[PDB]
């Protein structure tokens, strides 16, 4: 058995990394109460949302 590397441990962390990243964006949306908080979540949606907020005011 190879002891120099642990490809199982390498895989487990890379999976755990993206789950942590996806967990954080869930805390953002729930704490702020909005689906879009930064650019990139929905670029066209944020552009449409702001023009609607423009008219609402």
């Amino acid at each position: 058995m190879i002891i120099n590397h642990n490809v199982s441990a390498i895989f487990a962390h890379r999976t755990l990394k993206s789950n942590d990243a996806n967990l954080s964006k869930d805390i953002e949306k729930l704490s702020s109460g909005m689906r879009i908080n930064k650019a990139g979540d929905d670029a066209s949606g944020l552009a449409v949302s702001e023009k609607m907020r423009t008219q609402i005011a």
């Binding site: 967990l23 805390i27 729930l30 704490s31 702020s32 109460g33």
Partner: protein, 53 residues
């Protein structure tokens, strides 16, 4: 004089006084938005304890 007093007071109230029905709406929006982030605040605090095992 009493007529213009009624009109001016009506015009004044339309800019200065608040709509209590509309104001409770925005007040209730923020109060729930407060509880949301507070509950999600405790989630983010407990988040990092996972790797301590």
């Amino acid at each position: 004089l009493m007529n213009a007093y009624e009109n001016t007071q009506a015009s004044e109230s339309r800019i200065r006084d608040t709509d209590m029905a509309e104001q409770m709406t925005s007040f209730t929006r923020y109060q729930i938005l407060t509880q949301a982030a507070t509950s999600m605040l405790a989630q983010a605090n407990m988040k990092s304890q996972s790797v301590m095992r």
